[model samples]
Target: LDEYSRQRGQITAGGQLLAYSVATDGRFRFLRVYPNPEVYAPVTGFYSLRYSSTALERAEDPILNGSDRRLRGGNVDTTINPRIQQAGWDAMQQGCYGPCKGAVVALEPSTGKILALVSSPSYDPNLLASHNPEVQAQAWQRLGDNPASPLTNRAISETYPPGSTFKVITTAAALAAGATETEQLTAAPTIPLENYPCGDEPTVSLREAFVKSCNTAFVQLGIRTGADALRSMARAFGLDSPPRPTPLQVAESTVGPIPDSAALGMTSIGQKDVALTPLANAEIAATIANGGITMRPYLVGSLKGPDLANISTTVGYQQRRAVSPQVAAKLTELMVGAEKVAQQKGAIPGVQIASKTGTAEHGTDPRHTPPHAWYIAFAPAQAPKVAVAVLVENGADRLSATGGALAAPIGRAVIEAALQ
Candidate 1:
């Protein structure tokens, strides 16, 4: 029982304490508390007598429990920004409608530092962190039995089709294969094999296709770009990557095998087999914002001693090069075009943003199931402060639900909070 640190170190978010412990009379019973449990449960997970721990609690247990070689009861400092986290949470509450199973991820475009991470319908960590065994089991059961899974950390753990938001990557592939952004491509309302087209024009440039989200143009563009180039570029952007952590394990995004011409088209539009986590989606914009270097994401900012003196700092480094800086500029131009079109739906006053919206159809009966709404964006486009990705699962009600309608404003809220 003496093995457990009586004064267990705290977990802090940008100087604000998140998880800490209180000494109890009983040797084995240490009381853990999360003041804003519901807001940060996914990030700071519950430490329970019966369940052990999760997330940061599980990731840094050694230092937290004073068992590390440092033996100083080290604190884990997270990269989260209090205001941005609160903003992302509040936006999920306000901008979410229909089935509110969703997640948001905000990152510093240059540093790959996580600014905000949120998963909807969060459970209070305090419930599971309760000292009373009966109370702990009751809350744990309540959380598990619920279908929405308040316990799931969708931001990093769950994967969804990038839908149209993934086009920026496709756009990059085509650019690398010697296709100029302004060169006109097909623009029929349908790609003959699929029907996600947006216009009836016979032709449009790659830039025009991107802004309009013309599926036909992209499908043709992908087939022409070929499978090898497409796969190579997606991998370059970190799709089909190995699992890595920002402390917590993030589900790897995958560009599933494009076995044929048909599969290539669907993959190009982010549907056939390409899947991405909200964390991966956010990094796509972040990479573009940082001029094509996908900075490795980090959550724990530093390891600190009891007095809060830094033991080690997290350094952001280039994890991959998705595209050349000039190609990134071209993609940014297309995103800006998309943003101008986005403004017609609604505007984020005074700030210029480059963005892409997604309306992803899923389920065995794709036509019947409500589509997932998604948005990926970065503000003050040329020199960005924040990049965000938001997804609202089954967020649309067939005819009315769109990324623009549901998810964009939420992404807008997060970016604005970081900038403001």
Candidate 2:
């Protein structure tokens, strides 16, 4: 099909192309016409230039095609792996579900098989089966038009700076690069990056700094680890790209090239274009829980036919060695200590959890002033059961919503649900 793309007014040619003027009469189309034009309103980039593809569209009835998996017939496991699903559903009941904007995912430690993945603002998947064009159109419109992506599964798609959540990666890299977790590094609440004394100064042990989420200590440690090694460590934890090979609605992560001096400081702390989806973040925790290996994460567990005969079974995603099991053990210890400290201090209540909280400073906007809240963790601390990631946008205030304050509570709640 032929489509038209145009610039309605004086359009700048650089990165942000959607800002250009366009005519509605059919002459200007970027990629393809959005099924529901209203959805493009919150888009930060050129909306018209992108198009939807129906290539993967399948027939409605698998049973009709001699395959048995049918949406209508016998025994719909309406709930996929309920124990895990119920916890997420419980969280949703407690205000996480009302036009809510968040994601909850659980994975089996042994195979990396995803037990449950729930994205906020999700609609009934069955609607897509009926092909009610209007309903589909409306859904598209709602997602496209809202700046806050309701349809976008924040779990595997949306990107956020790791903030302190990145410390785990840094810890692994440093230890891998021969830096000791016990090495003491001075951790002033704010340490100057420029001039500093070299050897034997008062310092925070790698363990203490880690649990405390010290910015100065890790930022310094990151520079010493160097760009290449740090990047290597990041890739090991699934930071460099999408968590899995297969495509999903959530966009792939952009892990940016290692930076130089000024960029170096921030990059060490998981800022400056270094972003990850909650799933991508969880993959890191899962990797640690799995002893330094990351199994590709997936949504559908095992697809079956109407008669309960296995029509299609998802082996889940690919599994790969993301890091040495040694690194995983060390990182887990560090995270556990941090979680313990937070729990003991009453930042969170009632759970044995390993976690890192992240507080990201976006920029000048007052709204952006409040840092993003993040918590990444796995349970039991010894024999891990589930790994999770949580992010709350603008949840942290000047000293408040930082990971410790805001995200930790959510982390505790999720972990509590999982244990039960």
Error of 2 at 195 (Å): 17
Against the hidden true structure, what lDDT does model 2 obtain? 0.57
- Give the CA lDDT, 0 to 100, for residue 276 in model 2: 78
Q: Of the candidates shown, which would achieve the greatest lDDT relative to the real structure?
A: 1
For each candidate in turn, give its C-alpha RMSD to the true structure in angstroms.
1.9, 11.4
Worst 10 residues of 1 by lDDT: 396-405
Query: 142-255 in candidate 2: lDDT tens per residue?
Result: 657977665465666567777778777777888898888778776665665321122244676888777765678877888778888878888776665544432234455655
For candidate 1, write residues 1-420 as lDDT tens digits: 564446788999977889988777655656788988878988899888777899999999998887888653779989999999998898888775433578999999899999999999788888877767899898889889999899999999899888777778888999998998778878776666444445556798777788775777888888888999999998898988785788899998999989889999898888888889999999999999999999998899899888877778887788988999999898888888787876444366788899888677777877778778888989889898889999988775334323445887788888888988
Q: Please state the error at residue 110 of candidate 1 in Å.
A: 1.1
Instruction: Give the C-alpha miss distance for residue 256 in model 2, angstroms.
Output: 1.2
Tell me the deviation in Å of residue 215 in model 1.
Answer: 1.2
Candidates in order have lDDT scores of 0.83, 0.57
Stretch of 10 with least lDDT, candidate 2: 9-18
